[PDB]
């Protein structure tokens, strides 16, 4: 009776929210995001088994605004819907305040939106983990710092240094924790970072990736707009991983 509606179980847990988390892993795709000193990257698998499907047409990366990307991981159409809502939120916010929505606010508002679906009955939680990346201006110096905010189906919002979601999100995370005991991740370069991200993806999914099986999104202090990284450059990082 509690498994099918958004009421609490006796243990104080919301089944439909837990199950929405399983919707995140069900597709079998992993995503990794990582910030370095002056950039943030998000890498997600981009699997096109169907030879006849048009690779450039399917994506888990989305501009939310010019300065905020997001990667949705999970039930794809639920991700697409959150993106629409994000977009609306971002645009309503620009209209109301005259400025582009800061990414931690956008995340927070999307967490509010999710939370609602967990407290009002008969709305299915969106089975995605949203990962917004972007730069963020500091009030002291005006310098741009890179940010990664997730939102999950419970509405739990968080900022991260690196983060993975999706299938094997645990073995990806374990790999990055492990590589965070060596190096300091916010002192890295966009290259050393992407290498770590890609290596974590590779570790987790137990295979070497090719460039066209990932899709990578980036924001940088230099060029803050969120951009799909071209394959040429992902190939070069993947070469730099297999070597060193």
């Amino acid at each position: 009776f509690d498994k099918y509606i958004t009421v609490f179980s006796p243990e104080g847990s919301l089944y439909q929210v837990e199950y929405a988390f399983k919707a995140v892993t069900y597709p079998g795709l992993l995503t990794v995001a990582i910030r370095c000193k002056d950039a943030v990257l998000v890498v997600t698998q981009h699997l096109i088994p169907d030879r006849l499907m048009r690779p450039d047409s399917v994506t888990a990366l989305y501009e939310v605004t010019p300065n905020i990307g997001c990667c949705m991981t999970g039930r794809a159409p639920d991700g697409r819907a959150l993106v629409q809502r994000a977009r609306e939120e971002a645009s309503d916010y620009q209209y109301r305040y005259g400025v582009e929505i800061p990414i931690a606010v956008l995340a927070k508002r999307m967490g509010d939106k999710a939370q609602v679906r967990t407290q009002q009955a008969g709305l299915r939680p969106m089975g995605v983990v949203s990962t917004f990346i972007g730069m963020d201006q500091s009030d002291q110096d005006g310098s741009l710092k890179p940010q990664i905010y997730t939102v999950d189906p419970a509405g739990w919002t968080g900022g991260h240094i690196a983060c993975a979601a999706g299938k094997k999100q645990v073995e990806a995370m374990a790999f990055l924790e492990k590589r965070q005991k060596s190096t300091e991740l916010d002192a890295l370069t966009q290259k050393e970072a992407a290498m770590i991200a890609l290596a974590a993806l590779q570790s987790a999914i137990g295979t070497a990736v090719k460039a066209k099986e990932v899709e990578v999104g980036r924001c940088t202090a230099a060029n803050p707009a969120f951009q799909r990284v071209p394959n040429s450059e992902v190939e070069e990082w993947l070469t730099a991983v297999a070597e060193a």
Binding site: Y19, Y26, R75
Partner: peptide, 16 residues
């Protein structure tokens, strides 16, 4: 009862 409404996830995060 997991499969009667599209508002509901199954335990494996499917929507039946």
């Amino acid at each position: 009862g997991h499969d009667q409404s599209t508002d509901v996830f199954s335990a494996e995060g499917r929507v039946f």
